[PDB]
Design a protein around this nucleic acid. Structure first.
Ligand SMILES: [Zn+2]
Ligand SMILES: [Zn+2]
Lengths: 102, 49, 111, 97, 267, 213, 49, 256
RNA sequence: AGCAAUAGGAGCUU
């Protein structure tokens, strides 16, 4: 869905030069401040109040590759974040990625 | 069903109940600009595409 | 599982009370020395199984990508369970599966 | 076809599905037409073939050049022997026949 | 992928139990291969114990350092290599003659155990344990990490002189130790072959090296049904063995000859 | 137990040594050729069963054919030593005994290692020749292997004939190292040429010649 | 006939999968249980085709 | 232009004739500008069954030799080994990982305070020879503050967050080493980024405009000596940005 | 009776 499975040069450039799929799009980037504010509202607790002796079940939250906190219940946070993105409050090109085993 | 001409859409029998979250808008959109000119690209071996 | 110091908060190492022949645990920073319970001092494993059932969470029922099976919960008679194989990824690992009830949340197996 | 996604080949399959369709079995014929999944798997295989053709030819050409340079000076002489440019014998009779 | 092809003696070559006994003789096992988990217990008094399983055993074994090593031996793993407690304890004493004193539980015991005593020593015990687990051999030829029971469809003449197939057990291995396997009784010492022709050169000479080299090249070419005439591969292997040693097809081989400078520079 | 296996391996090595001597041209009595494991154990081992290797040490004389052919073929001494490691001391005794009874060639079969310090005395003991082999290497006779064709050292006149037939110089021949297992087994000295007849799938039979480095 | 043969091979593969999952598959020398499972499935599907 | 993503930890296996077995590599960049700053690996020395010390040693930027991990954890301001382990170990009950963690603790038992460890880092900072302790400390503290995970933060007084990210990286390293988690996929397309006209022109413009500001400095060194008022319209050589952008866009060579 | 070089990039057939 991201790059065409068929269009690639022959020869020594094979597989290194790719071609975008028709519905592909490249993100422009977006400020991370509203994301952090939404996260802070819904219940994320900071790392200055973190103690892995107690927090054995908590789910850790990364933002742009930066670990910024942990949550007691990722389910409602991902649901609300997805609803905010699908309502327009968050930029539509913002990834909201829950990992469940990790 | 039982159409000897139309291609068999895969059985998918292992899973009791599917919980889909998304659908492709159209599967031909995986191709790019140059591959989109090809008529019936699913009837060719990929090197020819 | 090695403990830590009740005063200096470092970790205690083994030692011998040659005048009593009892395994103590010595702090290399402070002078505190407490009595221990277990005379084991070392372990080594080659046939391990840590990571068999550990790959489970409370909300593992919320994963919509896991295949759902019809196995009966021996516990809770549930006719709906998501399932997966051993999450250890070694070459010689088994291929037996694990079964999680979405009703009772007990993990089980087919044996 | 490897599990390029986490525990699956494509995001249209479920986790830990080892069935033939999940791991690259194409049930249709070219006449009947491939499904999108079969099309993508066949594209991966054809791409592997193209990469192999593109990449092994350099090793093969290097090998053949080295063989030619190693054997370039070897000739059958009028006494039947097989000698190099130094006159050293490689075989006392060519092909042993 | 190093590999030997060990042809068996004919009496062994037809029987399967004998072939499996030869397999057991040729395969390499270390204490790692039969060890589950090693412990360390502080046992201040040699004649007594703080443990509750082996107290009866050591009271039946009697009528130095207080540091003890308690390694455990799984049942089926011990079972599969035809190994019992006696040979293992003997082998431990073989290299720890008098700088170590070995106790071993019996084979029928509900727990298969070994106990050792040293004659601050909580780290020399760890070093000794590592050296034992990583260097004690039990049986077989070092360098042979796996052995397979393979079948070869040899064609031999009948008693009427007519060629008839004949179904014999032979051996394939992983790893290479040609000299020691050729000596093992029950092996056809005149037919053992290796797929590493450097080993052949070190063991059998340069003509056998040429034969092995031709066999490998023929295998590589004829794998896919291609047929190259004999004389070309014969020439290639004769150039590679003409000096008495293996001359590689590289700059390190070609440019070490005595030919003119312009040829070597042109390459 | 392990003693029977040790004795059997030693007997196999002794048979290989005798096969070496007979192949090299020396006369060996037909009865000592067919030496069997039990009779060897009778004549060599002890009450405790461990073997005295100082009785195995024999003396071999050249067969008259290998004198008419190899005029430079003298008298052989073969010693199985008892010290696993061998030092300059034992090598000094061996060389003294070899020069003491004008033995042309002395084969010194050892067990474990010959230390480089001791090894340096091997070539400096002219005009006698001292070669050494390890017992583990001699367990299998490699000239009986199917991949090892039969090597036959040429005589001086035949080497000259070979060089003249091909209008050759010595350096233009295929070569064999003096440390080659079959050159070592044959006692090849520098300049001597073996003739190697071998199987040929295109012609049936093919004769090869290699010169010793 | 062709679709019956393909369905039979799919059933055979499903049986191999069941045998591997309930730990009853017979391994081969120098080959892992997972590699044995994969080799048997590949054999089955190549013979199906 | 296709490039691996930034500010993500990836853990790779290594090769047989290599003392290093497992390597966690992260490249760092800032939310403003989206430019690379520094890279910092945490390698696992010790092969399977060989290389008896299975320690983990970091590689800070601007230092020549690789520092052990407990040393930098102490240098960042958490001395007690219990707290170090807790930053590494979220679950005390797990035992195999704790059994694989002892050689690090032993190889870094010498240090017991922040100053000595931070000097130990400083003694390797690749600077000039013979700096005294009080400013070797300042140099090393500057390295630990800036050029160490700038994406986390570059201001002082927030070392705990950097310690937590280090604990996470070490934990992922051990998960990959203890086979409890699979190695990261190099070819996964989700761990890659595409640089379009925006970021490419941003990089080139940053280079050329720093060139221009250096020119402004190299003019204000001389002209101010004359002690005259200047109108700045002879101080900017406008041809620098124009020639640079035109050269790069006309040749394709992206750089000076 | 006289038609520069060096680079980079995109391609052709194996
Ligand atoms: Zn303490
Ligand atoms: Zn239930």
């Amino acid at each position: 869905g991201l790059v065409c499975p068929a269009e690639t040069p022959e020869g020594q450039a094979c597989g290194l030069v790719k071609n975008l799929s028709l519905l592909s799009g490249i993100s422009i980037g977006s400020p991370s401040e509203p994301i952090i504010n939404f996260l802070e509202e819904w219940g994320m607790e900071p790392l200055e109040d973190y103690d892995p002796a107690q927090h054995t079940k908590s789910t850790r939250i990364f933002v742009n590759g930066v670990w910024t906190g942990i949550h007691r219940d990722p389910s409602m946070l991902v649901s609300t974040m997805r609803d905010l993105r699908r309502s327009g409050a968050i930029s539509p090109e913002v990834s909201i990625i829950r990992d469940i085993r990790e | 069903l039982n159409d000897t001409a139309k291609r068999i859409k895969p059985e998918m029998s292992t899973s009791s109940h599917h919980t889909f979250t998304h659908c492709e808008i159209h599967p031909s959109m995986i191709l790019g600009v140059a591959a989109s000119i090809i008529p019936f690209p699913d009837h060719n071996q990929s090197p020819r595409n | 599982s090695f403990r830590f110091c009740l005063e200096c908060n470092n970790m205690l190492y083994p030692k011998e009370d040659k005048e009593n022949q009892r395994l103590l645990y010595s702090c290399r920073n402070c002078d505190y020395t407490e009595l221990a319970e277990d005379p084991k001092v070392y372990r080594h494993e080659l046939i391990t199984n840590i990571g068999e059932t550990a790959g489970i969470v409370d909300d593992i029922g919320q994963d919509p990508t896991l295949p759902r099976s019809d196995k009966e919960c021996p516990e809770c008679h549930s006719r709906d369970c998501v399932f997966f194989q051993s999450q250890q990824r070694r070459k010689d690992t088994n291929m037996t599966l694990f079964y999680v009830c979405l009703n009772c949340k007990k993990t089980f197996r087919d044996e | 076809i490897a599990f390029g996604f986490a525990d699956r080949s494509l995001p249209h399959f479920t986790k830990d599905d080892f069935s033939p369709e999940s791991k690259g079995f194409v049930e249709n014929s070219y006449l009947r037409g491939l499904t999108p999944q079969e099309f993508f798997f066949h594209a991966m295989a054809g791409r592997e073939g193209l990469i192999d053709t593109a990449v092994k030819t350099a090793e093969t050409g290097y090998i053949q050049r080295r063989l030619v340079k190693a054997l370039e000076d070897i000739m059958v002489h009028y006494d039947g022997t097989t000698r190099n440019s130094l006159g050293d014998i490689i075989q006392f009779l060519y092909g042993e026949d | 992928t190093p590999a030997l092809t060990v042809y068996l003696d004919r009496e062994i070559a037809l029987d399967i139990e004998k072939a499996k006994v030869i397999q057991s003789s040729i395969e390499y096992t270390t204490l790692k291969n039969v060890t589950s988990a090693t412990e360390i217990y502080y046992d201040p008094d040699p004649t007594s114990t703080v443990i509750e399983e082996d107290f009866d055993t050591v009271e039946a074994y009697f009528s130095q350092s207080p540091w003890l090593l308690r390694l455990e031996l799984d049942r089926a793993r011990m079972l599969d290599k035809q190994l019992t407690m006696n040979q293992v304890a003997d082998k431990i004493s073989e290299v720890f003659s008098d700088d170590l004193f070995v106790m071993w539980s019996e084979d029928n015991a509900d727990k298969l155990i070994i106990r050792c005593r040293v004659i601050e020593e909580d780290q020399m015990l760890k070093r000794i344990e590592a050296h034992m687990l990583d260097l004690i051999a039990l049986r077989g030829i070092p360098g042979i990490s796996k052995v397979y029971m393979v079948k070869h469809k040899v064609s031999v003449p009948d008693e009427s002189g007519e060629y008839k197939n004949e179904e014999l057990w032979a051996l394939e291995t992983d790893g290479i130790n040609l000299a020691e396997v050729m000596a093992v009784p029950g092996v056809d010492s005149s037919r053992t072959y290796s797929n590493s022709f450097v080993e052949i050169l070190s063991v059998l000479g340069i003509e056998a090296t040429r034969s092995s080299l031709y066999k490998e090249i023929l295998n590589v070419i004829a794998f896919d049904g291609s047929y190259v005439n004999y004389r070309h591969m014969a020439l290639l292997v004769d150039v590679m063995t003409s000096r008495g040693y293996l001359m590689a097809i590289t700059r390190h081989g070609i440019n070490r000859a005595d030919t003119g400078a312009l040829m070597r520079c042109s390459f | 137990e392990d003693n029977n296996r040790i004795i059997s391996r030693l007997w196999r090595s002794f048979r290989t040594v005798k096969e070496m001597a007979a192949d090299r041209g020396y006369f060996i009595s037909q009865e000592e050729m067919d030496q069997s494991l039990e009779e060897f154990r009778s004549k060599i081992c002890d009450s405790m069963g461990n073997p005295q290797r100082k009785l195995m040490s024999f003396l071999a004389n050249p067969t008259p054919e290998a004198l008419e052919k190899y005029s430079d073929l003298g008298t052989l001494w073969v010693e199985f030593c008892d010290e696993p490691s061998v030092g300059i001391k034992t090598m000094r005794n061996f060389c003294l005994r070899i020069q003491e009874k004008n033995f042309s060639t002395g084969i010194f079969i050892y067990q474990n290692n010959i230390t480089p310090s001791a090894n340096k005395m091997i070539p400096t003991v002219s005009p006698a020749i001292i070669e050494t082999f390890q017992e583990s290497d001699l367990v299998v006779n490699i000239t009986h292997h199917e991949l090892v064709p039969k090597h036959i050292r040429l005589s001086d006149g035949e080497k000259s004939q070979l060089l003249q037939r091909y209008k050759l110089k010595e350096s233009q021949l295929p070569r064999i190292q003096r440390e080659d297992p079959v050159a070592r087994y044959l006692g090849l000295k520098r300049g001597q040429v073996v003739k190697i007849i071998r199987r040929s799938e295109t012609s049936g039979r093919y004769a090869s010649y290699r010169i010793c480095l | 006939e062709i679709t019956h043969a393909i369905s039979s091979a799919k059933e055979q593969v499903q049986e191999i999968i069941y045998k591997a999952q309930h730990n009853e598959l017979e391994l081969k020398p120098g080959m892992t249980l997972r590699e044995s499972f994969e080799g048997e499935v590949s054999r089955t599907l190549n013979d199906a085709r | 232009q296709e490039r691996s993503a930034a500010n993500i930890v990836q853990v790779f296996k290594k090769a047989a004739p290599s003392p290093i077995s497992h390597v966690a590599e992260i490249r760092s960049a800032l939310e403003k500008g989206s430019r690379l700053i520094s890279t910092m690996q945490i390698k696992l020395y010790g092969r399977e069954d060989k290389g008896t010390g299975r320690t983990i040693k970091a590689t800070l930027p601007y230092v020549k030799q690789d520092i052990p991990i407990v040393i930098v954890f102490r240098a960042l301001g958490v001395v007690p080994d219990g707290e170090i382990l807790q930053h590494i170990c979220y679950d005390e009950n797990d035992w195999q990982m704790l059994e694989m963690l002892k050689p690090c603790i032993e190889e870094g038992f010498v240090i017991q305070d922040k100053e000595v460890a931070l000097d130990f880092i400083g003694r390797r900072g690749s600077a000039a020879l013979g700096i005294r302790r009080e400013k070797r400390i300042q140099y090393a503290k500057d390295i630990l503050q800036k050029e160490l995970l700038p994406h986390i933060t570059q201001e002082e007084g927030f070392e705990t967050r950097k310690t937590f990210f280090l604990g996470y990286m070490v934990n992922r390293l051990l998960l990959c080493a203890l086979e409890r988690k699979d190695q990261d996929d190099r070819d996964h397309f989700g761990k890659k980024r595409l640089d379009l006209a925006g970021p490419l022109l941003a990089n080139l413009f940053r280079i050329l405009f720093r060139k221009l500001t250096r020119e402004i400095y190299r003019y204000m060194q001389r002209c101010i000596e004359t002690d005259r008022d200047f109108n700045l319209n002879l101080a900017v050589k406008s041809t620098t940005i124009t020639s640079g952008l035109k050269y790069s866009l006309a040749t394709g060579n992206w750089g000076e």
